[PDB]
Write a structure and sequence with these properties.
Entry title: Crystal structure of carbon-sulfur lyase FnaPatB1 from Fusobacterium nucleatum subspecies animalis in complex with allyl-cysteine
Shape of chain A: globular
Order of helices and strands of chain A: HHEHHEHEHEEEHEHEHEHEHHHEHEEEH
Assembly: dimeric
CATH superfamily of the domain at 56-291 in chain A: Type I PLP-dependent aspartate aminotransferase-like (Major domain)
Chains A, B: carbon-sulfur lyase FnaPatB1
Largest sheet of chain A: 7 strands, mixed
CATH topology of the domain at 56-291 in chain A: Aspartate Aminotransferase, domain 2
Keywords: carbon-sulfur lyase, PLP-dependent aminotransferase, lyase
Oligomer: homodimer
Structural class of chain A: alpha/beta
Strand order of the largest sheet of chain A: 2-10-9-8-7-3-4
Strand content of chain A: 5-15%
Number of helices of chain A: 15
Bound molecules: allyl-cysteine, cacodylate ion
PDB class: lyase
Chain lengths: 397, 370
């Protein structure tokens, strides 16, 4: 009963997706001229959606707006916990103690703070590559050392090099593993056996794990999500991070769940944080977990068709492009090995030659030569324009 | 015209004069501004890209104080308390001292203790309810080479002093003499009595790059929950440090609300000031009539009354606990303001006059029956 084909204007909303691609993609100043008006770009880069936030969420916020006062706010009642807990209960069969829950502005700030709470200045921060570049930046931020275990590209199906991973985890300075569960940008939904071996390895060398599960509700319709903490429920050194922000297009609300079993780490967190909450943000998030499931299940259906359409479009019109439909996220990961070199800048190319803004190459640290990443969380009509522009521009090269 | 008499919503039957937020509703102009952003239907990654918010806040400062600041000196914060905690670390080395005037907001002290800097206090001078600065005591403590940061509360909380131009000049010159950084906490600068002008410290010292001015729509419009405040950092070094240590994304609903506050909120604010003035006037008459040994000067700013009860209690009697148990009023008082506040209670008058009358009656009855 929803119209995901509806085009939604985003001009003049202080959205980075429309207003700041020069800085975040190209580290260039706002003067930078393009062959295309800003409005003329198909924008498929930063991971927020072109779909509208469900009206149940918007109404939940308006309901809080009608209480008419927006003073100092902490989550006093158990409403928020119960809703988020029941959401985890019925979608993954996982639960957590309420007192293990703390709130953060977003998982990125959570990562930057947790790195300093967990790692001594000379310790290392391990993660699987290619990845979301902020796993590196979180470690660079406070002069910790990012280390990478390259995944294994079996024709688009990625697996973990467990021997390389155990070797790097075993290092005594390697103290923190940042896991992306499900993985960004490959889309891997980690199977139970994969997570067991990852967790057992971290238990062997007593390595702390931050599990970034921010994409865990954007799976393909035939996939289950397993929180790592579900398999390792007594390991005090796992931190679980979840947020309604990806699922429901709520990044602006800057609210996310950080589950910290370790009593010492959690006490550290609490003593370092301004522990007030935004009432409109709590109202939106609480609405998302209470009422947002029906919209999410239709969104999952629409994302699947977009993925299936994207494979057919590429098989037909970019046949030397290698592309496996991602098991999770709304992000398409396309290998253009056969068309480009490691050293050709794919974002700059597609901006100037296709009028499409995308991410690729070393925006995902390493292990991503000649890859582009496409945001498909937009109406099928806008996506089709994007794909036509991409294939046309690559062929003409 | 606005209905400040409206009761909004209602631990049992407590009259609450706890924490500095209002019982009045946020103006409908701000709420409509948020709902308008709600209707854009998407809430993705957000930075303050357009110049609208700057223009609104810039013009607000322009036409209400005759002060302006460069757009590039403006950075955003979750609140002035977090700003205080971080700015202490960017400015003061451990082993350096953080000076402020007492009594004060206790978070001036905690901001220093937080990162193991040292809090030091210059007591204000109480001449029959009118507070003044002991300028020689202040220069003595500022002159200390380890004393690096002065946190000024302008207007002052909890006395309510609206600092006159000469007072700010002498404070500013003293800090210029010893190169002491000043954080000017000006969060109450629009909650003044109708016959008071606010002077930002930086207006008088527009070339001293070491003043940071802090302002927010939060107290003025009941918006602390939106966690948005303006921090103006002339010093390019401090500002770059600030910028490199912060997650520089904003809540679009928060930006929409603060923007609406500065664009359209002035008329409600001038109506609020009239209503606060009458509440302050009633409070004096009420206490003069029913607690005649209580010493009380109408505060020049904030919606908080500062009442001296020297004559009914000892320094050792816990006033918050007394009024909790004996009057059913939750209030702040005593040593909740670092020091220089024995036997004081602070009353929130930012509520309908009928609720204030009930609260005052309970307070007077409990003290008189003591
Ligand atoms: C240019 C800066 C980050 S863009 C990455 C995007 N937010 C994602 O999560 O895929
Ligand atoms: C929850 As987030 C703002 O780090 O996408």
């Amino acid at each position: 009963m929803y119209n995901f084909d509806e085009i939604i204007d985003r001009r003049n909303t202080n959205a980075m997706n429309t207003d700041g691609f020069r800085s975040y993609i190209f580290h260039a100043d706002e003067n930078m001229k393009f062959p295309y008006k800003d409005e003329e770009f198909i924008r498929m880069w930063v991971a927020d959606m072109e779909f509208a936030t469900p009206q149940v969420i918007i109404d939940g916020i308006k309901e809080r707006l009608d209480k008419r006062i927006f003073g100092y706010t902490k989550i006093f009642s158990n409403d928020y916990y119960n809703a988020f807990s029941d959401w985890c209960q019925r979608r993954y069969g996982w639960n957590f103690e309420k007192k293990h829950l703390v709130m953060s502005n977003g998982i990125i700030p959570a990562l930057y703070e947790l790195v300093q709470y967990i790692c001594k200045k000379d310790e290392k921060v391990l993660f699987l590559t290619p990845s979301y570049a902020y796993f590196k930046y979180a470690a660079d931020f406070s002069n910790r050392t990012p280390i990478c275990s390259d995944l294994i590209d079996n024709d688009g199906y990625y697996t973990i090099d467990f021997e390389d991973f155990e070797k790097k985890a075993a290092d005594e300075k390697t103290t923190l593993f940042i896991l992306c569960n499900p993985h960004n940008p490959t889309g891997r939904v980690w199977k139970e056996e994969e997570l067991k071996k990852l967790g057992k390895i971290c238990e062997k060398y007593d390595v702390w794990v931050i599990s970034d599960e921010i994409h865990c509700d954007l799976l393909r319709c035939d996939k289950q999500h397993i929180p790592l903490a579900k398999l390792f429920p007594n390991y005090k050194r796992i931190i679980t991070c979840m947020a309604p922000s990806k699922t429901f297009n709520l990044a602006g609300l800057m609210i996310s769940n950080v589950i910290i079993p370790d009593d010492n780490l959690r006490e550290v967190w609490l003593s370092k944080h301004y522990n007030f909450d935004n009432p409109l943000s709590v109202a939106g998030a609480q609405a998302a977990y209470e009422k947002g499931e029906d919209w999410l299940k239709e969104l999952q259906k629409y994302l699947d068709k977009n993925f299936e359409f994207t494979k057919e479009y590429l098989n037909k019109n970019l046949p030397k492009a290698k592309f496996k439909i991602s098991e999770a996220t709304y992000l398409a990961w396309v290998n253009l090995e056969e068309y480009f070199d490691k050293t050709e800048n794919l974002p700059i190319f597609f901006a100037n030659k296709a009028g499409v803004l995308l991410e690729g190459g070393n925006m995902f640290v390493q292990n991503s030569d000649c890859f582009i990443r496409l945001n498909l969380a937009c109406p099928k009509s806008i996506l089709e324009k994007g794909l036509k522009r991409i294939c046309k521009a690559v062929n003409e090269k």
